[PDB]
A paper describes a structure:
The Vesivirus feline calicivirus (FCV) belongs to the family of Caliciviridae which carry a positive strand RNA genome which is enclosed in a capsid composed of 180 copies of the major capsid protein forming an icosahedral T = 3 shell. In contrast to the other genera, Vesivirus VP1 is synthesized as a precursor (668 residues for FCV) which is processed by the viral protease into a 124 res. leader peptide and the 544 res. We observed that the majority of the FCV VLPs obtained from the expression of VP1 in the baculovirus system are small sub-viral particles made of 60 subunits with T = 1 symmetry different from viral capsids.
The crystal belongs to the cubic space group P213 with a cell parameter of 358.3 Å. It became obvious that here was no electron density for the N-terminal 37 residues which correspond roughly to the NTA domain. The particle has an outer biggest dimension of 295 Å at the position of the spikes, whereas the shell extends only to a diameter of 185 Å. There is no indication that the structures of the S and the P domains differ from the corresponding ones from the T = 3 crystal structure of the viral particle. A comparison of these different oligomers in the T = 1 and the T = 3 structures confirm the conservation of the contacts within the oligomers. The conservation of the arrangement of the VP1 capsomers around the 2-fold, the 5-fold and the 3-fold icosahedral axes between the native T = 3 virus particles and the T = 1 VLPs shows that the antigenicity of the protein is conserved and that the use of the T = 1 particles for vaccination is a pertinent approach.
Residue numbers in the entry:
A (entry chain C), D (entry chain O): 161 to 662
B (entry chain K): 161 to 341
C (entry chain E): 233 to 341
The structure:
């Protein structure tokens, strides 16, 4: 019928899990006006610049005649932001019961300062829901008793109409919706500190990483392009023995080579020892911890905590066969190698095949990345003292009841056989976008992303205004890895990201 | 729209916890007439000296289809003060069920001796609620079994309008609301 | 010819053309006259609002000439006139002297 | 005004370069009906399933009062496909002059068999343009005299309206528009046979490649996932010396490991010779060709044409240090290594650190990819005899006046210093899609893609129904590499892809 059928039916937006353990007064939908709500509108809005009117919002719950409880509805005017307190209720509101099978549908009228709302106006009328009266249940007791879900649909109000038709091509002055970061599919994900695909999650209280990490304003504390490619550096043949300290050749960070690893040696170690031990091979898996016993040991081997990497030797004047490569970042005074945490154009050591005293100079070329030195079960990047900052220290603490995560990756080792992994802050594909794009997100509203395994388990992940990953569970566990994700939008970080995991 | 939007929507007033251990007949809202009810009115009243008409009162409970019980509603005329006894019920009343999801909204009509109510008149019409029939619950037993809450909103009746406009500064003869200690 | 809505700034690339446009020929002796409709966020535009509707022109198809060869072959000029639209009217009458909050046009250096 | 402003103005579609050397009668717009034309419609159509009516088409040329020539317009009914012959004109047509400054605008009325057109119906009314009378120019002479361009816009006809509103989520039965393959940006492109970013184009008459190559029907002659990751194989320690022949561990091709290189040794060579020569180092660049002279030589070094790759050794029972890796695919009868072209679960050789006669077995683990053996200026994959087929031989000859290309990549070498490159068939990101998606394209209509450097140069690339890259120039040259692409749609491969390069 009408060429505007969407301007008629209802589209789903989001839904939340109202738990019986959720104390009186607690926000549930900080959702605000603006065509960013409904997807159709949001899509259509790509062709205009002007919007006005309101948006109807139908939503309901599936309460059982047993339950009892009431939800509140309040239309927050522009310029104010709702707080998760009670006082919010000393405001004209609309009570709402859990039994009511009839889904409620009211409208968020647009009160405006201007005539027409510029696409980007993030300051508009808003509506919210708060648990008036707790959710009671006749068979209380232990654990998270229960709690039903609540959905929320959306339909463009009647009085809602656009206005200014933009001419195609004239780049948008603001930024697209952040619901386009993580790829819907677990397959191609891969860490940002290491080119391996993720295979697990890390529930932590703190997170820190600058190398290849990008901010939401496109800025980056880092020192390297959001991609993994070979590292080409020119080192001046020392004539004596191993040297290090070789400045890069072509990178978007004066000195500090784009692609150069992350951490540094956790102790004033020296460069030497052939196949330096860490004892017992064949004695596979008798070893994790602190060397397990006297005979059997867990860590030494001289150049420990070193980044292994194939490498093509230059030749300058002459002499062949690549041969080595063992790197990191620290000060190379003498034949020692004290660790620096601050990274500058004077801390890039390596190992070589220099040789011959004519003092032939400017050796090598390139080297990649393959492994690292088996420092026990230390998932690289778990301590500030080990992460190398260029100046600043990008991080994030537990905002709201949410906790920060990492992305348990996997890093091959050498001397041993094959093992150990390493964390990760941003799913590579993300950073990639961050740097190449430019969005808009409230410094208090994450970027709700749904994750789901192959059974039923599912949880949400958020994105910090800085660019980190958050979770609403105290601990997550094992789940079928044929994972796939999705995007919801934004929600005040002050609310937990529900999940049906465990 | 109307420069009097408050004279339209409902504002919260107070709410109480109706427990299943609360014996038959027990007051819950000794609340009385007078602009002191709704905050908007109460605030606006600061500019007048005269008020009249009634005030509508919407309020409800969130009962579960399981529960059973009835609440009573009674409009106590001025000059009398409700007692927490049963006999109160041998008076025209309006029964009320815990299941009813529909929130009730009736009015407290202003019966008056005078023409216009002086701001301070603490002797006016009044409304109250009493637990007609206990609150029963199929899974009784030990401790304070359970008991749901009940809210109460307020909206200025239609026939409610002030009257005498006081000139600013002329100190108020009575006293402000104690909700400021 | 393309009418760029407010909040965006035209780039000297091609993609600009994957937008509703109006082709224009070099032969057409008839001078074209269209309007730049004002789409606005507010009700009335404050004198200083530098963020408004906009129009632009881009060379769709190169300028060809049957006698090519060396040097800057040739190339003709193009003019542009202006007339206040009908629906264009002011609104707030400022009282003299009340210093202007913004700044005069730089065409006076 | 109208919430349907697009249903009013005109949108650009495509334009062509009408040359004065273009002989009488030659198609220029095989364009056919269907919302796939206009982008707005095409986009909107995502929400329906039914469309009907016609589409208006405004387009014109910028002819100079000097020129002379006429273009023809013909509305080809459904079920027939226009031929690039003259006879096409013995059909009711509409003549068209080069001088006419007034842009013509007619409609392609929808004649239909059914009531409503199912989204996928590729058999509908169609319109085309053919050069009635050559393009004449008073100052003829040498070279490609001249020739002006012609554009073509589109606007949804009035009588054009959709019909069936599909419910979201119910996966589309057909396939999206192929205008979404190549990434708009030269940056992240990288070859499909090698993980290096492209840096040049190869104008060739023939093309062949199966490994990591995908068809348009999602099928692949290949033997490996459209991605680059380490190759893990288990080889049975021979006890004697070097072995090879080790079956994979986990790949979607029985035997043939996913990721295993492409070509094989071009001669019955053996496994030996330490730093086997190919003479003169330091004698840099005195050497390309056929060894240049007696003293100086260009190719031998025993294990020539071998794929170099770091590799982590297993250990089975015992004994350490990775150490080697040099691979390819051929039969390993004895200590010889004759080349097989046909690849089966019995042709995967390597080099090792087996040792000790207890006959300790099942050695190694993994190995990656770094280099190859300097076979002169041979851009790997330039001869059928060198490319390894699993059974079939995917390729493409010069369809129409168009020529096939490759993607001159870059592959590091060893013994020398650093040099030589290698071809490539599909821009990786492409194959990636091909395998993960499912589109629709006429076996005679490419996928027009525009390429542009940083000056002005620009040309088009097409996609074969099989999945190859084509060009409309006999030779392309050097151009500023800050390249970026785009997508147009589809055009009968029988037409050349114009370009403003050279």
């Amino acid at each position: 019928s009408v060429d505007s059928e969407w301007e008629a039916f209802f589209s789903f937006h989001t839904s939340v899990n109202w738990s019986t353990s959720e104390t009186q007064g607690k926000i549930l939908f900080k959702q605000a006006l603006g065509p960013l709500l409904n997807p159709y509108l949001t899509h259509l809005a790509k062709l205009y610049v002007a919007w006005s009117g309101s948006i109807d919002v139908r939503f309901s719950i599936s309460g059982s005649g047993v339950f009892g409880g009431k939800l509140a509805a309040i239309v927050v005017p522009p310029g104010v932001d709702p707080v998760q307190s009670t006082s919010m209720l000393q405001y004209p509101h609309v009570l709402f019961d859990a039994r009511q099978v009839e889904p409620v549908v009211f409208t968020i009228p647009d009160l405006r300062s201007t005539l027409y709302h510029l696409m980007s106006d993030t300051d508009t009328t808003s509506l919210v829901i708060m648990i008036y009266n707790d959710l009671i249940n006749p068979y209380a007791n232990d654990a998270n008793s229960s709690g039903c879900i609540v959905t929320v649909e959306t339909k463009p109000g009647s009085d809602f109409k656009f206005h200014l038709l933009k001419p195609p091509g004239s780049m948008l002055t603001h930024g697209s919706v952040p619901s386009d970061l993580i790829p819907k599919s677990s397959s191609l994900w891969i860490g940002n500190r290491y080119w391996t695909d993720i295979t697990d999650f890390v529930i932590r209280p703190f997170v820190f990483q600058a190398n290849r990490h990008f901010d939401f304003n496109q800025e980056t504390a880092g020192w390297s392009t959001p991609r993994f490619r070979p590292i080409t550096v020119t080192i001046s043949q020392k004539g004596g023995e191993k040297l290090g300290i070789g400045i890069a050749t072509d990178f978007i960070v004066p000195g500090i080579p784009d692609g150069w690893p992350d951490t540094t040696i956790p102790s004033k170690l020296t460069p030497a020892g052939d196949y330096a031990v860490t004892t017992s091979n064949g004695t596979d898996i008798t070893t994790p911890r602190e060397y397990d016993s006297a005979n059997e040991i867990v860590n030494n081997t001289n150049f420990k905590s070193m980044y292994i990497c194939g490498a093509l030797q230059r030749a300058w004047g002459d002499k062949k066969i690549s041969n080595t490569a063992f790197i990191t970042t620290a000060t190379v005074e003498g034949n020692n190698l004290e660790p620096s945490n601050v990274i500058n154009p004077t801390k890039i050591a390596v190992f070589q095949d220099n040789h011959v005293n004519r003092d032939v100079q400017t050796s090598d070329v390139t080297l990649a990345l393959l492994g690292y030195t088996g420092i026990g079960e230390e998932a690289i990047g778990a301590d500030r003292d080990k992460v190398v900052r260029i100046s600043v220290l990008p991080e994030t603490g537990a905002r709201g009841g949410n906790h920060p995560i990492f992305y348990k990756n996997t890093v091959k080792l050498g001397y041993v056989i094959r093992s150990i992994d390493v964390f990760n802050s941003q799913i590579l594909h993300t950073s990639r976008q961050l740097s190449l794009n430019n969005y808009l997100l409230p410094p208090d509203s994450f970027a709700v992303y749904r994750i789901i395994d192959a059974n039923g388990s599912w949880f949400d992940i958020g994105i910090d205004s800085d660019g980190f990953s958050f979770v609403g569970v105290s601990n997550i566990g094992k789940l079928e890895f044929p994972l796939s994700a999705s995007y919801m939008g934004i929600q005040l970080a002050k609310i937990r990201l529900a999940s049906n995991i465990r």
